[PDB]
């Protein structure tokens, strides 16, 4: 998307945050027409701000918007459980420009690093013509990691697959992936790993055939 | 080119108009002045 | 009030053609703009177009070109969409919107977006009708740091999506974190769900995942037991 927004923020209930639409002169600069839209999950986009500054009938009182110069931004006082969901900047520079969307949530949880869990391809699966193997994770926070595979050491990017998290009952979240290979492919290799990596500090798995 | 005479042009609905044909071959000559252009998009920056 | 109401979802397979439709309802039809957006599942918003009802007057954006078939039925108040070649990545659903100030006269706008449709999800899948196999994830010794454990099992091979995972016939919910079902590389689908059982357990209780595939009917209950080494 041609406008940039942050990934995901996190305030306290009752608090307020800024979220940050920035491009080029040629749309946030040169334009009036930065919009705004809520989104609740599973459900349609609804408008929220408009002409970089406008609120549609029936939007409350707590939200508003801005832009500084070549930066338009978006406002939201007295937060509320009813505002937890997904936020995009839209504004026009000749097309339709829009902002990648940012996630809301609540603020004061302390950092937590993650959990892994790693298994070999069950026998049943061996005899079945497949090699595919799970690796799970859960209860972490703040919520951005980056997962990868290395047969030994030189990577493989064949065969990969990826869920996308949910918040579990705990205020933090959990996920899952796949590999898809061959009995050739798992009886031939040392092992395989699964490993992690957050705010500098990193973390691994691995398991092997038997 | 092709001819149609039902038209309901100005788009109205409720009431449309039938043009009754003419004999024989028409021919009209015109004289043209004057046009009417929209444009593209954001595509490609600076590009075509 | 006004309304946008779109087409249902489908489920066809790719290089085919999709058309989805919006109806509204509750304004002056003829005089207001229709945008179509869809939004590829986690993704933003992709903007497809849009429909002047006003003789026809269209406007499509660059990327989206020639894919995309937009018209409406001025008579019967139904505007419709076309998308073709059909590719995985054609997979999203589908919005229609309108531009918020509109008249039968003069006009502008470009921002506005307010009445949107409900969406329409196309899926894009070359798989077919297989029976997956099932098989437990089974913990280990060193995965046991505290005295708990993590398991589950995998739906792989099956198709079409999804498949839930419930455990013991509904008798543990605790801990229990199911993984939304994704698309392999093959087509066949793939899911998988967690729990979390303590390790002075591990003798004294069954943990077995109920996994259910309907459309290729082969239902694998797999019970995860520990690893006899
Ligand atoms: C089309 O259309 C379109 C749209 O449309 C749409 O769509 C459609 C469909 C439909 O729908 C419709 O409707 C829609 O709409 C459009 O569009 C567009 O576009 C464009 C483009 O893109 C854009 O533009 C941009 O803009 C911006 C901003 O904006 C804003 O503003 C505006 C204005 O401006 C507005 O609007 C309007 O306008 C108009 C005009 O236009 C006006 O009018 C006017 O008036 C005036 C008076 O006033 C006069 O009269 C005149 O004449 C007229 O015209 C009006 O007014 C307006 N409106 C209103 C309402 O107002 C807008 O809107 C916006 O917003 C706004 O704002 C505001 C304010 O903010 C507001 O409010 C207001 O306020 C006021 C005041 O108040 C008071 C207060 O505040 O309160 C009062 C008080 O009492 C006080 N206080 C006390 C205490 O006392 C206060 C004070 O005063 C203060 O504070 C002071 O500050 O105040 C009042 O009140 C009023 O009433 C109110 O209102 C409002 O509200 C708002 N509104 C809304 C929101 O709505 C701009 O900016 C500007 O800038 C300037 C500069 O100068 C300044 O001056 C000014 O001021 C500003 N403004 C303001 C306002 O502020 C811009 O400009 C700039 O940039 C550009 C670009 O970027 C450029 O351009 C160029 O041009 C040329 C010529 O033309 C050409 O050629 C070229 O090509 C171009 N380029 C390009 C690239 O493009 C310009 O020019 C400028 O720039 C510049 O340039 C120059 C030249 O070149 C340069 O010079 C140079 O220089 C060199 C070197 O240098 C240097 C120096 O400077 O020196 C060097 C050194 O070294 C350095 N330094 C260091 C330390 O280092 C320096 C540095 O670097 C720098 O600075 C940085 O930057 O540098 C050598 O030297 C050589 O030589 C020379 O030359 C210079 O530099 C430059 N600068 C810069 C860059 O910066 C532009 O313009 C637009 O915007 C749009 N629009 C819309 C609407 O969006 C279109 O256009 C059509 N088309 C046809 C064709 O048309
Ligand atoms: C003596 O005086 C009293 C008081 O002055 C008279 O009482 C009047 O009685 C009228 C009926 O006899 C009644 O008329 C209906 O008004 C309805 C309300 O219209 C307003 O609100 C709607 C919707 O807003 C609602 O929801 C929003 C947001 O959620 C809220 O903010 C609002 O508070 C409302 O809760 C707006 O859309 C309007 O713009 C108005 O603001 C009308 O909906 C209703 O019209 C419907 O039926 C019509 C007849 O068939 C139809 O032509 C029209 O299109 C409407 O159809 C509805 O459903 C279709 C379904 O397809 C949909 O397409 C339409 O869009 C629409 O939703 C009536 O007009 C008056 O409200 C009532 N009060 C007043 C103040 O006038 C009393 O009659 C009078 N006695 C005599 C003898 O005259």
Redesign the interface.
């Given at each position: 998307?041609?406008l940039t927004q942050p990934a995901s923020v996190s305030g306290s209930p009752g608090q307020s945050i800024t979220i940050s639409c920035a491009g080029s002169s040629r749309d946030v600069g040169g334009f009036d027409?930065v919009?705004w839209?809520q989104q609740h999950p599973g459900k349609?986009?609804?408008?929220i701000i408009?002409?970089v500054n406008k609120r549609?009938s029936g939007i409350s009182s707590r939200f508003s918007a801005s832009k500084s110069g070549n930066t338009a931004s978006l406002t939201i006082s007295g937060l509320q459980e009813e505002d937890e969901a997904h936020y995009?900047c839209?504004?026009?520079?000749?097309?339709?420009?829009?902002?990648?969307?940012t996630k809301l949530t609540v603020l004061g949880q302390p950092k937590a690093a993650p959990?892994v869990?790693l298994?070999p391809?069950?026998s049943?699966?061996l005899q079945?013509n497949?090699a595919?193997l799970?690796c799970?994770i859960?209860d972490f926070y703040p919520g951005a990691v980056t997962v990868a595979w290395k047969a030994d050491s030189s990577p493989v990017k064949?065969?990969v697959?990826?869920?996308?998290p949910?918040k579990?009952s705990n205020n933090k979240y959990?996920?899952?992936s796949?590999l898809?290979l061959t009995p050739e492919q798992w009886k031939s290799h040392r092992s395989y790993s699964c490993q992690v990596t957050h705010e500098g500090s990193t973390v691994e798995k691995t398991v092997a055939p038997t | 080119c092709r001819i149609k005479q039902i038209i309901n042009m100005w788009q109205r609905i409720g009431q449309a108009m039938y043009a009754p044909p003419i004999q024989g071959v028409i021919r009209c000559v015109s004289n043209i002045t004057g046009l009417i252009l929209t444009r593209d998009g954001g595509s490609t920056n600076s590009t075509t | 009030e006004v309304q946008l109401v779109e087409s249902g979802a489908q489920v066809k397979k790719p290089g085919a053609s999709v058309t989805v439709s919006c109806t509204a309802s509750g304004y002056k039809f003829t005089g207001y703009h229709m945008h179509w957006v869809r939004q590829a599942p986690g993704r933003g918003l992709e903007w497809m177009g849009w429909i002047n009802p006003f003789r026809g007057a269209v406007k499509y954006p660059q990327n989206f070109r020639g894919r995309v078939s937009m018209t409406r039925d001025t008579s019967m108040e139904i505007f419709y969409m076309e998308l073709s070649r059909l590719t995985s990545d054609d997979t999203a659903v589908y919005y229609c919107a309108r531009e918020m100030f509109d008249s039968s006269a003069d006009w502008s706008p470009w921002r506005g977006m307010v009445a949107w449709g409900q969406g329409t999800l196309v899926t894009v899948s070359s798989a077919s009708t297989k029976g997956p196999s099932v098989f437990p994830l089974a913990p280990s010794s060193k995965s046991t740091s505290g005295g708990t454990a993590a398991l589950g099992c995998l739906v792989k091979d099956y198709f079409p999506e999804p498949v839930t995972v419930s455990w013991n016939s509904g008798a543990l919910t605790s801990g229990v974190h199911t993984f939304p079902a994704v698309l392999q590389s093959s087509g066949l689908y793939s899911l998988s769900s967690v729990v979390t059982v303590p390790s002075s357990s591990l003798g004294t209780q069954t943990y077995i995942c109920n996994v259910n595939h309907k459309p290729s009917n082969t239902k694998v209950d797999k019970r995860v037991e520990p690893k006899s080494c």
């Open positions: 998307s041609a027409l919009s839209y349609a986009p609804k408008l408009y002409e549609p995009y839209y504004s026009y520079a000749d097309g339709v420009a829009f902002g990648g969307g959990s869990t298994f391809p069950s049943e699966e079945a497949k595919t799970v799970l859960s064949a065969g697959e990826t869920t996308t949910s579990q959990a996920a899952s796949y898809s | - | -």
